[PDB]
A paper describes a structure:
We found that the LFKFFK segment from PSMα3, identified as fibril-forming by computational methods and which indeed forms fibrils, shows dose-dependent antibacterial activity against Gram-positive Micrococcus luteus and Staphylococcus hominis, but is nontoxic to S. aureus, the secreting bacterium. We obtained two atomic resolution structures of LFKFFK; both revealed a departure from cross-β fibrils and atypical amyloid architectures. The second polymorph was composed of out-of-register β-sheets, meaning that unlike in canonical cross-β fibrils, β-strands are not perpendicular to the fibril axis. The second polymorph, featuring out-of-register β-sheets, shows intermediate quantitative measures of amyloid stability, consistent with the previous suggestion that this mating configuration could be associated to the transient nature of amyloid oligomers. The second polymorph of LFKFFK is composed of out-of-register β-sheets, a morphology that was also suggested to serve as a pathway to toxic amyloid aggregates, and the interface between the sheets is reminiscent of the KLVFFA segment of amyloid-β42. Thus, the two different polymorphs of the antibacterial peptide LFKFFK display features which, in human disease-associated amyloids, correlate with toxicity. We correspondingly suggest that atypical fibrils of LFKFFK encode toxicity to bacteria, while the reversible fibril formation provides means to regulate activity. By not representing a spine that recapitulates the properties of the full-length PSMα3, the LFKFFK segment exemplifies how an array of activities can be derived from a single polypeptide, through generation of shorter derivatives with different structural properties.
High expression of PSMαs, which are four peptides of about 20-residues in length, increases virulence potential of methicillin-resistant S. aureus (MRSA). Amyloid aggregation plays roles in PSM activities in S. aureus. In the present study, we investigated the structure-function relationships of PSMαs and their short truncations.
Residue numbers in the entry:
A (entry chain B), B (entry chain A), C (entry chain B), D (entry chain A), E (entry chain B), F (entry chain A), ...: 1 to 6
């Protein structure tokens, strides 16, 4: 599971 | 801006 | 899932 | 401006 | 889904 | 001016 | 769907 | 002037 | 659909 | 002057 | 930023 | 098991 | 940062 | 059994 | 840091 | 039996 | 550090 | 039987 | 028939 | 820039 | 028909 | 930059 | 149809 | 940088 | 379709 | 650095 | 698809 | 350093 | 998939 | 020093 | 998989 | 000095 | 597996 | 001096 | 396995 | 002086 923000 | 969850 | 804004 | 969700 | 404005 | 949703 | 004005 | 919706 | 004026 | 709708 | 659990 | 952040 | 248990 | 952190 | 029991 | 820490 | 019993 | 520490 | 460029 | 035909 | 570049 | 056709 | 680069 | 098509 | 590099 | 496609 | 290096 | 793919 | 060296 | 793969 | 030297 | 694998 | 020299 | 393996 | 000289 | 093995 992951969260990614740019 | 980008927010990506998986 | 994602949100993208430009 | 662009807002794109998928 | 998206919204685009110019 | 242009507004485009899809 | 769109609206366009010139 | 022009207004165009579709 | 459109409206055009000159 | 011209007004044209379609 | 990235947060990744597995 | 793990948590990873960047 | 990384935390890993096994 | 172990715990590892970086 | 690492803690390992066996 | 053992415990190990680094 | 290491503690080892047998 | 023994105990060992380092 | 109508052809409109702008 | 645009071309429009009806 | 409509072709719009910007 | 974009191209749009309807 | 829509092609949008940015 | 991105390319978007609909 | 969407291709996004950053 | 990343590449994202949808 | 997503490829992320850091 | 890391590589991540989804 | 994830490959992480430190 | 370490290598980690998931 | 994890390989850790210290 | 040590090597650890999981 | 663990190999520890001191 | 010692060598330890698990 | 353990080998200890002193 | 001694040697010890387990
Ligand atoms: Na999530
Ligand atoms: Na969403
Ligand atoms: Na919409
Ligand atoms: Na409309
Ligand atoms: Na009308
Ligand atoms: Na977890
Ligand atoms: Na544990
Ligand atoms: Na123990
Ligand atoms: Na004992
Ligand atoms: Na033109
Ligand atoms: Na263009
Ligand atoms: Na581009
Ligand atoms: Na890139
Ligand atoms: Na890298
Ligand atoms: Na390394
Ligand atoms: Na070593
Ligand atoms: Na030694
Ligand atoms: Na000796």
């Amino acid at each position: 599971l992951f969260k990614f923000f740019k």
